[PDB]
Subunit: 173 residues, 4 copies
């Protein structure tokens, strides 16, 4: 797992799928027409740390909600692409808007729409409950599951590849 | 598990129970008289894929809610029978409305009201936390639990019996 | 576990704790002052079956909510004691209102306020995540956990002690 | 684990992190701009028992919500510090407001902002899913997880160090 650090070493943009990654994949509705989505605290600190080391954060999700916009604002996720199933076009599109190579993009997803972004990114990540064929195509599969530390895990991972992790920890000791 | 593909081979209608199958069986209420129900993302893609291969989707649930109507609309579940505990009459009734044999119906349920629909369908499915006697009567018991990929699993299963799965995957590679 | 059937044989009233028994013990609040509580479908069918065999159902909970009243109405839980921590006085009080002996009362609870009702009932039940000393005092500890089939399990148990279970199942075959 | 009782023996203030400790770390939003947070019943009784033995309770959380204020009021958590990430300054600040030494403070947390409060408290606690470096620095790691009895466990622990537990149990037998 040192060859993982090799691939995360020059990452400048970290892009995330939402449902199944930042959440546990539950889509929650109520009888007054209200939707709800749940996230994980520790993913929050992790993304703030990552972003803090200079890495830019993006969300690319096929679904569309205000709570994705809310979670994103508070963690400094700056590029928020909702209602877009084509993750690679979306991501290549960001590549060009920021002047950053794909080989310096990290992408985490958990299902078929995520497959090509995961395969084509410089660093491609999936989760234990990701679909088999997205997993098969990724550089890394997290130990922690989605909505339960998977994103935190990757955040620590890239921090450590870029020699930025211990220093962030040291901030709290 | 090739004899499972044999039974799913000529399925034209896939019917689902809701609570315990598309959800994890939690019935959620709040102090302002509002009900809520949670579904799983990966079940969503799966049902869209199934429906896409020409299979028609139905919901038959003893309970009645607007969020069942919401989830159904977005996944293209076209026949939505709520407040009906008698699943087999309901299902036989659909049989006749669509001109489709029962032996070409697939049914997944997880409790006693589902038992006869599961036993009488051409392809009968239950889940690990289904009641013992519905399980005992089904052609297949999923590995993934309800509200956690059980429906996705069956969706891939019928896609593969009907030689439609790899092609759907190929759409994302 | 035939000596369990011996104690459930002449039960006429089944009383339940709410939080940790019918729910998984989560107390859920939101930022607009709204409380929510989650129940399990399979517990619902089970309580309807039990009640159906002539057994009367009661709720005794130290907390107080409208969703306890909602869940109770729909399952035919007819006696609903909220904001009462003293479960045994509450239960003895029901004893006298219905002309039914305590030795013919079943009680399930999961924490210290439930301890004496569990110890003094004719049939006393707790759950795996119940506190140690309520468990130590109960005739039966369920396999399924609270808000996840514990109540269903007990319901089947008393049905079977009273030779009423197979017949209820037969209704669905 | 008798050396744990040694450190909890003279505790007079028990301070808690919120997200990941009293909750399971989920941050829940809905499409009408509403946030929700879930707590555990058994943690409630436990904190009431602890407080009852004369111990004063405080919340120190980096996040800010009305449901933290609600949960706190009902359990008698009397000092509620929200929107404050610096837990040790916050806690030392309470030290001085109550005339109580830090060595007589207990602190439970689960992530980096909690690390120094956990290390510097007379009794420092973390949970199984706490970050590695906060855990490494704590006197005790609970068996039960956050939002699932971790706080209850610690509550019983300090009660027992201070010879107050059996007596509290005896109140229910």
């Amino acid at each position: 797992m040192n060859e993982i650090y090799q691939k995360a070493k020059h990452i400048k943009l970290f892009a995330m799928d939402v449902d199944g990654i930042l959440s546990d994949g539950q889509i929650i509705y109520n009888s007054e027409g209200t939707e709800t989505k749940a996230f994980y605290v520790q993913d929050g600190l992790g993304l703030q740390a990552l972003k803090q080391s200079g890495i830019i954060l993006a969300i690319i999700t096929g679904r569309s909600s205000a709570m994705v916009d809310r979670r994103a604002k508070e963690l400094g996720i700056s590029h928020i692409i909702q209602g877009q199933d084509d993750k690679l076009t979306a991501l290549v599109g960001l590549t060009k808007k920021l002047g950053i190579e794909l080989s310096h993009c990290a992408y985490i997803g958990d299902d078929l729409p995520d497959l090509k972004a995961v395969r084509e990114a410089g660093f491609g990540i999936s989760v234990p409950n990701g679909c088999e064929q997205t997993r098969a195509v990724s550089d890394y599969i997290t130990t922690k599951t989605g909505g339960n530390g998977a994103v935190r895990e990757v955040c620590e991972l890239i921090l450590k590849a870029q020699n930025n992790f211990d220093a962030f920890i040291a901030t709290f000791q």
